[PDB]
Write a structure and sequence with these properties.
Two copies of one chain form a homodimer. The first copy, chain A, has one domain: Heat Shock Protein 90 (2-Layer Sandwich). With 206 residues, the first copy, chain A, is of the alpha+beta class. Chain A has four helices and eight strands. The first copy, chain A, is globular, with a radius of gyration of 16 Å. The structure holds ligand MOJ (2 copies). Chains A, B: Belongs to the heat shock protein 90 family. Chains A, B: This is Heat shock protein HSP 90-alpha. Chains A, B: It is found in: Nucleus; Cytoplasm; Melanosome; Cell membrane. The PDB classes it as chaperone.
Chain lengths: 206, 206
């Protein structure tokens, strides 16, 4: 069974802004998802210091970058905290509502799309380069879920191969955005923007 | 009763680095503590979406900046998550160990003290401007604690006036660092470095 949800209207407006505004510096999408990955890894690490059994779902704390020219996907994998169904359906949308409002105001006031992360809604920069985003996620208290959206105001969730714990963000790239499947291009961006992440980052080859 | 603890040796080395290195751009200390404050506020906000009774200790989510020329202190107050005794004594030191190691390597490799926050140990930039730091903190599962250090390799904790929930970082400033008690100076730094924090920041007057 696949369940369909409407984004909060502010988030839909944000996604449309990201998709429709002329903004050539699209490469910052990768910095934002890696930083989301690091934050999630920080969280599970901290929680494990009081409840060590929280690492029973996997001890390695890392980030994989996986390009696939056949599928036209760039996948960012982490072994971080993951997201619950409540995260996916209620909680993250509640928080993204205010971040979106603050980012929107900042943009009218002369801020720049690259500053999206300062407002805690940098996941949505995924839509700079991707026509569809698929998110596979597994949290300790919960099942593995598959979340998906091509924007248009809605997303789907189904129970989801098994990943132990963590998040996989699958970017189905736009046809004119395939430079992001290229090794020297990804390497360049990681070096420029993600040089000091405190977890190992592996760029897979094809 | 006052309990005395030794810092992990890496953290002591970090504090000494911050205190001893010639580095004129000391104003970044304020950006780091405000950002710590925002992160703590983000955390209690998120936790409240699944357990609303976590806001029984205070609903307001804000940051106060309080200068006092008589005491020679700058105090940064938040109503964020607070810290437990385990945080103060075991947990934060365990995490700061790796951040310190990574920051140290980065500095040898040509990084700059201002980048301290990318390594998750930006609290310690407090020692750029302060001879002593006192931290009053209250977390929901725990008592109110007073943490204190003038560096030198040790810190104290005692049970601590009652603050409901949150953290107060009290900077006892160095004699040559009193510009940070001045209104137009603090305003300047907040504008330059903290312009987009998603919680209200009130600069108290004297
Ligand atoms: C746990 C986690 N891991 C990774 N890699 N990325 C994110 C998380 C999250 N944990 O709460 C939040 C998630 C997020 C942040 C801000 C935001 F505005 C949206 C999301 C998000 C992402 C996917 C599906 N639905 C919402 C971004
Ligand atoms: C909850 C909280 N609030 C505020 N304002 N600041 C901090 C927190 C924290 N929550 O875990 C961690 C704290 C911190 C981070 C990194 C770090 F390396 C040290 C500390 C810290 C601070 C005071 C006493 N002992 C340790 C910085």
């Amino acid at each position: 069974e696949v369940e369909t949800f409407a984004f909060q209207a502010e988030i839909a407006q944000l996604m449309s802004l990201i998709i429709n505004t002329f903004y050539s510096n699209k490469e910052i999408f990768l910095r934002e998802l890696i930083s989301n990955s690091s934050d999630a890894l920080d969280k599970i690490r901290y929680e494990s210091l009081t409840d060590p059994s929280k690492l029973d779902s996997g001890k390695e704390l890392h980030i994989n970058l996986i390009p696939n020219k056949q599928d036209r996907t760039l996948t960012i994998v982490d072994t971080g905290i993951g997201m619950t169904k409540a995260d996916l359906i209620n909680n993250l949308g509640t928080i993204a509502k205010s971040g979106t409002k603050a980012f929107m105001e900042a943009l009218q006031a002369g801020a720049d799309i690259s500053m999206i992360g300062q407002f805690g809604v940098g996941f949505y920069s995924a839509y700079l380069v991707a026509e569809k985003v698929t998110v596979i996620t597994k949290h300790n208290d919960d099942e593995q879920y598959a979340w998906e959206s091509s924007a248009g105001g809605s997303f789907t969730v189904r129970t989801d191969e098994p990943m132990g714990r963590g998040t996989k963000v699958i970017l189905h790239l736009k046809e004119d955005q395939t430079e992001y499947l290229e090794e020297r291009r990804i390497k360049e961006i990681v070096k420029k923007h993600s040089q000091f992440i405190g977890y190992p980052i592996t760029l897979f080859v094809e």
